[PDB]
Design a protein around this ligand. Structure first.
Ligand SMILES: Nc1nc2c(ncn2[C@@H]2O[C@H](COP(=O)(O)OP(=O)(O)OP(=O)(O)O)[C@@H](O)[C@H]2O)c(=O)[nH]1
Ligand SMILES: Nc1nc2c(ncn2[C@@H]2O[C@H](COP(=O)(O)OP(=O)(O)O)[C@@H](O)[C@H]2O)c(=O)[nH]1
Ligand SMILES: COC(=O)Nc1nc2ccc(C(=O)c3cccs3)cc2[nH]1
Ligand SMILES: [Ca+2]
Ligand SMILES: [Mg+2]
Ligand SMILES: [Mg+2]
Lengths: 440, 427
C-alpha cells in the first residue's frame, strides 16, 4: 500500500504533471494506453509502483492523480494528448474562466465554485487506497489558480484528511519566463495561507532552471517544455524512493524526519546532477565523486541562494543508478574536507544517504543526456531564506503604493490579509535567522 | 526451563533472525524444523528455545513483531524463514517512522494487545517459563518505543519472570535519523526499571570492529549482525548445552547484578571473525583470554580501564585445558586487580562448554558488568542535550501527544543513572 495521490493545480502544476507522469511511465515500462506487460498481477497489486499507479481489471495502470485548472485549454491538451488514455475523464477537472493571476479569484470568487467537485474527485481516489500516505501538490506561486486555489485546497484537505501528509512542489516566480507583475502578491499570500497545512515544500526557482537549461544544456532560450523536463527529473529523483524498491533504498519520509527540525522550517533546497547534453556526455563518464561534488556547486541548485553563506541543518543524498556505498562514502569524505559546509551547533553533521538501483530515464527527443548515475541532494539550509527575502522585497515595493491591490479588494479581499500575510513572512525570515544562531 | 523470545522492529528482527539461524545450526535443526545432528548433547536442552511439534519438528519459541510488514516479509523469505510459527508473526501496516512516541503511545498501543495474546499462548505451553528475551534497537520507533511498551506490559502480567534484552545502541557513525538520541534516551529509562539484564550492543563498537580489526572497508548491517548473533550464541550457550553451568536466568542474574538499576552489560567475543573469511589456526588459551578483556573486542565502545568491574562472567567453548583457562583468567585479574572492585570477593567467574560454535575450534564470550558503561549513557546524553537545548525535532513527538516534560524527565533519570555508576567507581 502506502499510496500517494498527486494533485496538479493551474497551468504550471498541470504541465509539470504531464512531464512527470510521462517520465514515470517510461521508468516503469507503462505504455501510453496504460498497459504494462511486465506486470503479471492483473487488476491490482502491492508493488512499489502501485503507490503512484492504480490498476483496472483490463490491465490499465492509472495515475493516482487529479488535474485541476479554472480554465480548460491547458488540461484540454492532456485530454487530447499522447497520454489521454492514461487518465479517466473524471481525473481532469476544468472551469471556464481562470483567476487572471489574481489570488482572490483562485481562493474565493472562482475557486469556491469548483472546490467541492475537486474534493469529491480526490475522495474517489482516496477511497481506492488501502493505506493512503498523503498528497503531492504541484502549483505555481504566481498564478491565480496556482496560488489562490491551491491554498484553498490545502485548507480543505487539512479538514477532510486530518494530519495526513501534504507535500508541495512549488514554482517560484522568475521574470525571465513570466508576463505577470502581481506574482509577488500571490506568492506571499499562498505561502502564508499554506504554511500551516504543508509538511514539506520543494521550491523550484524558474530562474535557476532557466539558467541550468541555458548553461548546461546549451538551450538558447528555454521554454516551459525545456524547464518541465528538467523539473520532472528532480521530481522523479525525489519520488523514486516511493516508486521503486531496493535494499539501500531510503523512503522519502525518513529523509523528511531529518529535513524538518521545526514545522515552519520545511523548505528543502534541491540540487541535481548531472545535467549534461548528449554532445558533451559522449565519451565522458560522470563518476560518483564527480556528480556528488556537483551538488555543492550553487549553479546546480533548484533555488538561487548561497548555502556557503548560510548554515546547514540537514544534508541528504538521493542517488539513482550505478552507485554503491563505498564510492559514496569516499566522495563525501573528500567533499567534507574541501567544501564550505557548516552546520548549526544543535544538529549532527552526517549526510543521510539513499540509493535506488534503477538508473535515470530520459524522454525521447529531450535535451538531457542519458546517464548511468544521477544524484539529488536535499539540504536544509538557512540560505533558502534568501529566496523569501527577494520576494518579500518586491512585495514591499508595490504594497507601499498599494499597486494592483484594487484588483484583490474588488474580488472581496481586505488590506488586512496582505499585511497579515506579509508579517507571517517577516516572522518566517526571522525564524530562519534564529535557527542559525549558536546555542547558549 | 523454557525461554520466550521476542523480536521487535527492523533491527530487532534482523539480529533476531540471525540468532535463530545460528543456534538452529548448533542444535542441528534445518530450515524445515527437522533435527539432523549427530550428538544427543544437541537435544538435551533444545526445549529451552524450541517447541516440539507433532511430526517431530522443532519450532522456535519466538514472537516476531513490527509496525510495518517490510522486514518480517524479508524474514519469512529468509534462509530459516519457514521455521517460525506463522501465527507468531504480528505486524501492523502504518510503521513507526523512527518515532518512539508512535511505537510507545499511538501506533504501537493499537497493536500491543495482539502481541500479548501470542506471548500468553506460548507461556501457557511452558512447563516452567524461566524468562523472556527481547532483541531490538533503541534508535528507531518500533523496537525502541513499542519494545519497551511490550516490556512494561509483560512485567504487569508476569511480574515474577526474568526479562533480558539485547539492545542495539545508536551511533552517529551508523545512523539512520537524527532523532536516535531522543528515542534511545526515552528507552533507556524503561530498561533501567523493567529488565534484569540489558546487553548494550553499541553500533559504534560493532562498526569499529568490522573496520579497524576485521578490515572491512565498508561494513553493512549484515556484517554488524554477524558479531551480534555470534555473541548471543555465546551468552546463551550456558542455557542451551549441558556443562559446568545449569543456572536458570534468575540464578544467572543474581550473581551478576549487585544493584537493581546497574544491569547494563558490556558483551565481548573472541576470536573476532568476519563472515566467510575462514582462518585456520585456532587461538591458544592465553590468546583467547587476553583478547576478551581487550577493549577492541568490547561491543559497547566503552573503555573498561575508565571504570571498574562489578562482576565478570566468561564462557569458554571447545575442547581445551580448563586448568589452563583457570591460570590465564587469574592471570588477567591478578595483573589488573585495580579495575575490579574489591568489595565483591571472587567477582570473576568462568565456565566451559565442550561444543564450539560453527567455524571455530574454540571461542570465548565475555560478559562484563563495568561502571565504564556510563560512557555510553553520557555519550547519548550529550547528543540528546545538543538538540533538546533548542527543542529541535520535538514536533515529531508533540504531534503524537507527548510533552516536553517527559523528555526533561527522561534526560534527568539517565543523568541519575550516570552518577549512580560514578558512585561505585570511586568506592
Ligand atoms: N516551470 C514552469 N513554470 C510555469 C509553467 N507554466 C506557467 N509557469 C509559471 O507560472 C506562473 C504563472 O502562473 P500559471 O500557472 O500560468 O497561472 P495559473 O496557475 O494557471 O492561474 P491563472 O491566473 O488562473 O491562470 C509564471 O511565473 C510562469 O512562469 C510551466 O509549464 N513550467
Ligand atoms: N546492528 C544493527 N543495527 C541496526 C540494524 N537495523 C537498524 N539498526 C539500527 O537501529 C536504529 C534504527 O532502528 P530500526 O530498528 O530500524 O527502527 P524500528 O524498525 O522502528 O524499530 C539505528 O540506530 C540503526 O543504526 C541491523 O540490522 N543491525
Ligand atoms: C537470554 O538471556 C541470557 O542469556 N542471560 C545470561 N546471563 C548470563 C550470565 C552468565 C552467563 C555465563 O555463561 C557464565 C559463565 C561463567 C560464570 S556465568 C550466561 C548468561 N546468560
Ligand atoms: Ca499488478
Ligand atoms: Mg491559467
Ligand atoms: Mg529502520
Amino acid at each position: 500500500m502506502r499510496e500517494c495521490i498527486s494533485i496538479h493545480v493551474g497551468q504550471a502544476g498541470v504541465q509539470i504533471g504531464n512531464a512527470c507522469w510521462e517520465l514515470y511511465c517510461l521508468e516503469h515500462g507503462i505504455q501510453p494506453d496504460g498497459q504494462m506487460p511486465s506486470d503479471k498481477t492483473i487488476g491490482g497489486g502491492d508493488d512499489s509502483f502501485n503507490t503512484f499507479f492504480s490498476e483496472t481489471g483490463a490491465g490499465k495502470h492509472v495515475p493516482r492523480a487529479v488535474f485541476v485548472d479554472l480554465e480548460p485549454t491547458v488540461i484540454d491538451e492532456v485530454r487530447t494528448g499522447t497520454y489521454r488514455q492514461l487518465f479517466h475523464p473524471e481525473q481532469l477537472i476544468t472551469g471556464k474562466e481562470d483567476a487572471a493571476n489574481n489570488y482572490a479569484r483562485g481562493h474565493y470568487t472562482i475557486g469556491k465554485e469548483i472546490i467541492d467537485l475537486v474534493l469529491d474527485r480526490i475522495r474517489k481516489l482516496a477511497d481506492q487506497c488501502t493505506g493512503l500516505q498523503g498528497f503531492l501538490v504541484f502549483h505555481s506561486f504566481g498564478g491565480g489558480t496556482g496560488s489562490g486555489f491551491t491554498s484553498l485546497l490545502m485548507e480543505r484537505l487539512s479538514v477532510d484528511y486530518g494530519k495526513k501528509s501534504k507535500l508541495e512542489f512549488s514554482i517560484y516566480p522568475a521574470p525571465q519566463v513570466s508576463t505577470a507583475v502581481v506574482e509577488p502578491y500571490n506568492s506571499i499570500l499562498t505561502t502564508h495561507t499554506t504554511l500551516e497545512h504543508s509538511d514539506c515544500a520543494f521550491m523550484v526557482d524558474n530562474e535557476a532552471i532557466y539558467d541550468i537549461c541555458r548553461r548546461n544544456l546549451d538551450i538558447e532560450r528555454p521554454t516551459y517544455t525545456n524547464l518541465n523536463r528538467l523539473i520532472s527529473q528532480i521530481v522523479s529523483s525525489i519520488t523514486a524512493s516511493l516508486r521503486f524498491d531496493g535494499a539501500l533504498n531510503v523512503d522519502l519520509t525518513e529523509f523528511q524526519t531529518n529535513l524538518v527540525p521545526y514545522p515552519r522550517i520545511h523548505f528543502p533546497l534541491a540540487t541535481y546532477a548531472p545535467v549534461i547534453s548528449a554532445e558533451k556526455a559522449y565519451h565522458e563518464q560522470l563518476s560518483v565523486a564527480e556528480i556528488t561534488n556537483a551538488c555543492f556547486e550553487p549553479a546546480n541548485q533548484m533555488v538561487k541562494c548561497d548555502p556557503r553563506h548560510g548554515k546547514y541543518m540537514a544534508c541528504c543524498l538521493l542517488y539513482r543508478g550505478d552507485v554503491v556505498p563505498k564510492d559514496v562514502n569516499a566522495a563525501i569524505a573528500t567533499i567534507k574536507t574541501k567544501r564550505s559546509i557548516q552546520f548549526v551547533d544543535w544538529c549532527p553533521t552526517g549526510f543521510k544517504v539513499g540509493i535506488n538501483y534503477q538508473p535515470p530515464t530520459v524522454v525521447p527527443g529531450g535535451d538531457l543526456a542519458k546517464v548511468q548515475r544521477a544524484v539529488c541532494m536535499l539540504s536544509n539550509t538557512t540560505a533558502i531564506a534568501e529566496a523569501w527575502a527577494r520576494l518579500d522585497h518586491k512585495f514591499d515595493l508595490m504594497y507601499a503604493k498599494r499597486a494592483f491591490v484594487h484588483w484583490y479588494v474588488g474580488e472581496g479581499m481586505e488590506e488586512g490579509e496582505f499585511s497579515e500575510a506579509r508579517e507571517d513572512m517577516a516572522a518566517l525570515e526571522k525564524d530562519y535567522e534564529e535557527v542559525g544562531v549558536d546555542s547558549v | 526451563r523454557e525461554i520466550v523470545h521476542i523480536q521487535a522492529g527492523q533491527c530487532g528482527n534482523q539480529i533476531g533472525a540471525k540468532f535463530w539461524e545460528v543456534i538452529s545450526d548448533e542444535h542441528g535443526i534445518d530450515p524445515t524444523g527437522s533435527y539432523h545432528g549427530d550428538s544427543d548433547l544437541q537435544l538435551e536442552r533444545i526445549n529451552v528455545y524450541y517447541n516440539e511439534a507433532t511430526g517431530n519438528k522443532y519450532v522456535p519459541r519466538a514472537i516476531l513483531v513490527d509496525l510495518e510488514p517490510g522486514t518480517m516479509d524479508s524474514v519469512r523469505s529468509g534462509p530459516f524463514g519457514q521455521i517460525f510459527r506463522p501465527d507468531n508473526f504480528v505486524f501492523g501496516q502504518s510503521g513507526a517512522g523512527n518515532n518512539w512516541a508512535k511505537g510507545h503511545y499511538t501506533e504501537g498501543a493499537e497493536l500491543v494487545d495482539s502481541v500479548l495474546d501470542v506471548v500468553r499462548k506460548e507461556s501457557e505451553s511452558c512447563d516452567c517459563l524461566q524468562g523472556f528475551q527481547l532483541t531490538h534497537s533503541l534508535g528507531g520507533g518500533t523496537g525502541s518505543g513499542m519494545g519497551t511498551l511490550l516490556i512494561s506490559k509483560i512485567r504487569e502480567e508476569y511480574p515474577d519472570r526474568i526479562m533480558n534484552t539485547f539492545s542495539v545502541m545508536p551511533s552517529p557513525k551508523v545512523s539512520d535519523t537524527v532523532v536516535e538520541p531522543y528515542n534511545a534516551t526515552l528507552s533507556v529509562h524503561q530498561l533501567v526499571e523493567n529488565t534484569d539484564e540489558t546487553y548494550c550492543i553499541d553500533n559504534e563498537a560493532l562498526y569499529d570492529i568490522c573496520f579497524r580489526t576485521l578490515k572491512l572497508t565498508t561494513p553493512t548491517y549484515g556484517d554488524l549482525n554477524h558479531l551480534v548473533s555470534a555473541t548471543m550464541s555465546g551468552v546463551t550457550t550456558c542455557l542451551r548445552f549441558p556443562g559446568q553451568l545449569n543456572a536458570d536466568l534468575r540464578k544467572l542474574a543474581v550473581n551478576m547484578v549487585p544493584f537493581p538499576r546497574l544491569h547494563f552489560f558490556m558483551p565481548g567475543f573472541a576470536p573476532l571473525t568476519s563472515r566467510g573469511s575462514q582462518q585456520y589456526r585456532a587461538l591458544t588459551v592465553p590468546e583467547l583470554t587476553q583478547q576478551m578483556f581487550d577493549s577492541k573486542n568490547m561491543m559497547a565502545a566503552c573503555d573498561p580501564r575508565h571504570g571498574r568491574y562489578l562482576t565478570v562472567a566468561a564462557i569458554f567453548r571447545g575442547r581445551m585445558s580448563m586448568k589452563e583457562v583457570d591460570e590465564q583468567m587469574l592471570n588477567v585479574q591478578n595483573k589488573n586487580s585495580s579495575y575490579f572492585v574489591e568489595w565483591i570477593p571472587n567477582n570473576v567467574k568462568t565456565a566451559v562448554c565442550d561444543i564450539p560454535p560453527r567455524g571455530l575450534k574454540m571461542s570465548a564470550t565475555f560478559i562484563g558488568n563495568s561502571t565504564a558503561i556510563q560512557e555510553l549513557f553520557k555519550r547519548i546524553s550529550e547528543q540528546f542535550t545538543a538538540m533538546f537545548r533548542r527543542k529541535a525535532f520535538l514536533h515529531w513527538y508533540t504531534g503524537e501527544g507527548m510533552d516536553e516534560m517527559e523528555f526533561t524527565e527522561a534526560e534527568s533519570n539517565m543523568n541519575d543513572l550516570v552518577s549512580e555508576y560514578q558512585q561505585y567507581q570511586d568506592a
